[PDB]
Design a protein around this ligand. Structure first.
Ligand SMILES: Nc1ncnc2c1ncn2[C@@H]1O[C@H](COP(=O)(O)OP(=O)(O)OP(O)(O)=S)[C@@H](O)[C@H]1O
Ligand SMILES: Nc1ncnc2c1ncn2[C@@H]1O[C@H](COP(=O)(O)OP(=O)(O)OP(O)(O)=S)[C@@H](O)[C@H]1O
Ligand SMILES: [Mg+2]
Ligand SMILES: [Mg+2]
Lengths: 437, 90, 437, 90
């Protein structure tokens, strides 16, 4: 019984209203309570930021503005930071009980504009006792000091600890992928786009349109062999099908862990596998009727893109209301609660899908971490909130939910934020609780 | 339960520390408090004592880059990760 | 002491999951409680629908998708309706205690597509005793029946009651404007756009970008005389200023009822009146240095659009955080709670602004109704929710808030919705409560 | 207050009507119920009796296009706009 990787803590350093702060994530559900403006989102913010230090994607619109295509407006992180050196560190414990530490050094550039400077890094082999805060801060003249990257280097040069500041984000992820934290391999900005896009869709909650539009990009895996075992008549048509079915069978399983759902009037969510009517005929020709060039003609009659099976399929999400049975998931026709509980579900399939698609390129004693968000949870009714919890328990997943409310769940850890004022500065007073239940 | 009676009753016990110089050690305080009521509403009661304590001031060493340690209570799994509420504010 | 006009009830007939239903609005705050998918929004939906039966604007995106520019996707009302004849009726009681009734007859067109058919109408002089439901429904063979418009006509032909089915929406509003319900005169689709746009911005909550962008369209009144008293040297420049100031003074007052605010870390919201730097010089020329043609040159040196003072001003909203004092309102930099509590505030100014700009074209014993929404209220913390309530009490305003929560306020009327299933159809079981407090 | 004790205690009084054939007249029921507790938690108690009553079935004449009338209680301003819960559902 392999132990799965979990996220253990989030520490923001010098973050606005948070000088040095650690948030211990529960083994299952962690809730941030507090009032409007408390700082619960800038927490979930920093988290993301470290998880994906890409200033090209990182964009925190206000929730009141979700489906916004706005690409000009302010990205919104610069302001959650304080002047000077700032940190965002994540602490993960491997399937091999390996305490790994991956963060970013956030620094607002020379107070001219509102642009931020980021630099990914990693710490390795830190003792399970030493606090994550202690690593990034000193004590100079009885005053606390945030040391910089070059100062960390020194500090850990003649040590077992291994500080590796990455030059390319590409390597930062390539790292988290090996020590088994990420479920996927973010080899490119095309791969990053999707990763973030998904995260974005769980923070804000609901049915992602970008994901729906191109569902067979977040689901259908690229079988590294249908091309290889090819380049090296109907044989193709058969293998294409003996592949489409194999996948269908695969999805057909995910679809099972979402039949007894409960969000609003939605009692279930499927992934319907439809075959494009066009390629539907092509597959008929190669059966009952230079090669890439061949298909090229057949397609026309009625290139290597017809060798990629995912280009034949056509996914489509569906919801189960006690009325018209299985209808295609549609925002316009769903309440906010079901809207959230539907997308959150799609999301689960994408994660399960990615993670399994990676068992190859990964060790065999490593199962990535899995954590999803839920900002403005009050939107869900207790009945719906239970379906999320029980679903996450089953898929063995970590949750971090923001309750604009001051009544959290009793399952898991609860952090209470209260933004106060001292020395005329923003100072968030945090207090966690856990164990009750 | 969330009775206004208790809440006021609580502010009395907590405000007590506000009087003297004795800061608030939510760990010690919770430990003693929760022993008065049955696990009936430990979570509810705890929550109150946490929000109330927070009203009567803040923690000094909180701004020292010193990580707070989960202090357990009960002969079970209860924990409170909070510093000592040093500096009170009128 | 003039009594102000209030909305008394909303009745949906044949609406999905609501065959015949009346919602009594409180004199101040009315809350719809229920779980996800309960039907609280389709209620607020129908309301809007009747308030503005324009299928060109009416568009109910899911809240999870707010800042969406999507103009193609399904409008979302068709599905809240049932087959056949449907109604949406509003009951208002005049400043002259006149019970007026304005609604719309919603009817999904010949089940081919997803298009809806609407027809505005009004009933007048109905006795304060007769139920609003009874007017639109019969009893045929011990079975209830929804009668149609032509059937209502008959029914009220040889009666004092006055049923007037409007042909042009333009007249429908022209009506509500006279009997004093609307705060403005919706004479054109340009006027409608804005009205709806505002309503849209309170249902979804937060800072409207469309409104902000062109704030001096929802605020600066068109003084019907600066042109008239003109067409019939520095005299202009003086009157322009003796007008800009007059308005500034006007706004300067609204700005006062929002200094002791409390949303998140926002303690106040102003309307800052800035003068465009360009026209700023032009006004200097006409002072210390065929007519429309004249200014035309002056502008160039450094048409009748320079006679409209609102074209000189340049509004800009500001929020007051205990940190940088007065900063320009910006989503990116505000939490969701303050985001909502800020826009809601701007909104109040627009309403006050419109209503007063209409005292002329209106009687002198008529003060329009004033009601604002708040969907997904749980987003606000109790502290913030109090600032809304106390603000509305002061401006003497009606509120209708949707609580995805099952804990409403104790101030006002509370309607509890519970969507059940009978004869395999959606049936919402409503139960109101009020008086406790 | 929202004690699980009361809630169960309440389902007992309400389920009583479920037994016989006696539908539920939240107006009569609330009127009697709220008289047992002080205005302390009238709103809270009322709310429970309203959600509980709703579980044990629905109203017939609700689907008759017949407007329900606000039935006051107390020697004050309390009202309940609800039909009679006819048809119970097991
Ligand atoms: N880019 C920014 N620049 C300056 N201040 C910011 C910025 N982003 C957020 N804030 C401030 O931080 C506070 C909001 O913190 P958040 O973490 O969004 O709070 P919140 O607790 O999530 O509040 P909700 O969502 O309203 S319940 C506000 O009071 C803002 O003044
Ligand atoms: N255009 C539509 N077509 C079909 N069903 C719809 C449509 N719009 C809404 N619904 C249904 O009505 C229910 C939602 O009703 P709403 O009035 O949005 O509920 P709600 O109580 O506001 O829920 P929240 O916002 O999630 S708390 C859902 O369960 C949908 O199945
Ligand atoms: Mg809704
Ligand atoms: Mg926020």
């Amino acid at each position: 019984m392999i132990a799965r990787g979990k996220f253990r803590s989030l520490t923001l350093i010098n973050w606005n209203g948070f000088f040095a702060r650690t948030f211990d994530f529960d083994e299952l559900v962690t809730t941030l309570s507090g009032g409007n403006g408390a700082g619960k989102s800038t927490t979930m913010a920093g988290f993301v930021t470290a998880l994906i230090p890409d200033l090209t994607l990182l964009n925190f619109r206000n929730t009141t503005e979700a489906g916004s295509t706005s690409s000009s407006r302010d990205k919104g992180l610069y302001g959650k930071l304080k002047a000077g050196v700032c940190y965002a560190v994540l602490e993960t414990v491997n399937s091999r009980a390996q305490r790994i530490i991956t963060g970013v050094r956030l620094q607002q550039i020379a107070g001219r504009d509102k642009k931020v400077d980021i630099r990914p890094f990693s710490l390795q082999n830190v003792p399970m006792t030493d606090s994550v805060i202690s690593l990034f801060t000193e004590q100079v003249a009885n005053k606390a000091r945030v040391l910089s990257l070059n100062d960390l280097k020194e500090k850990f040069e003649e040590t077992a600890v291994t500080f590796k500041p990455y030059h390319s984000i590409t390597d930062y992820h390539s790292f988290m992928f090996d020590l088994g934290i990420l479920p996927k391999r973010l080899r490119s900005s095309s791969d990053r786009n999707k990763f973030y896009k998904l995260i974005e869709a769980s923070l804000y909650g609901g049915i992602s349109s970008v994901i729906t539009k191109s569902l067979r990009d977040y689901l259908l895996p690229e079988n590294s062999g249908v091309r290889q075992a090819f380049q090296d008549a109907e044989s193709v048509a058969n293998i294409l099908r003996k592949t489409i079915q194999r996948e269908q069978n695969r999805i057909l399983q995910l679809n099972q862990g979402l039949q007894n759902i409960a969000f609003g009037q939605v009692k279930g969510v499927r992934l319907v596998v439809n075959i494009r009517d066009t390629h539907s005929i092509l597959l008929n020709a190669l059966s009952d009727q230079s090669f890439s060039e061949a298909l090229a003609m057949l397609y026309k009659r009625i290139g290597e893109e017809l060798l990629d099976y995912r280009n034949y399929l056509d996914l489509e999400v569906e919801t189960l209301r006690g009325a018209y049975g299985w209808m295609r998931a549609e925002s316009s026709a769903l309440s906010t609660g079901e809207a959230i509980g539907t997308g959150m579900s799609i999301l689960l399939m994408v994660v399960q899908s990615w993670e399994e698609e990676s068992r190859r390129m990964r060790a065999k004693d490593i199962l990535p971490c899995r954590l999803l968000f839920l900002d403005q949870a009050a939107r869900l009714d207790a009945m719906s909130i239970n379906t999320l919890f029980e679903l996450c328990e089953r898929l063995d997943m970590q949750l971090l939910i923001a309750a604009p409310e001051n009544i959290s769940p009793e399952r898991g850890t609860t952090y209470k934020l209260v933004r106060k004022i001292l020395a005329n500065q923003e100072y968030v007073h945090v207090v966690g609780l856990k164990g009750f239940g | 339960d969330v009775q206004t009676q208790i809440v006021t009753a609580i502010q009395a016990e907590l405000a007590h520390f506000r009087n003297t110089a004795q800061p608030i050690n939510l760990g010690a305080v919770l430990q003693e408090q929760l022993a008065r009521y049955p696990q009936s509403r430990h979570f509810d009661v705890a929550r109150i004592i946490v929000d109330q304590a927070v009203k009567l001031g803040m923690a000094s060493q909180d701004h020292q880059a010193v990580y707070p340690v989960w202090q357990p209570i009960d002969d079970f799994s209860a924990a409170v990760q909070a510093h000592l509420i040093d500096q009170y504010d009128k």
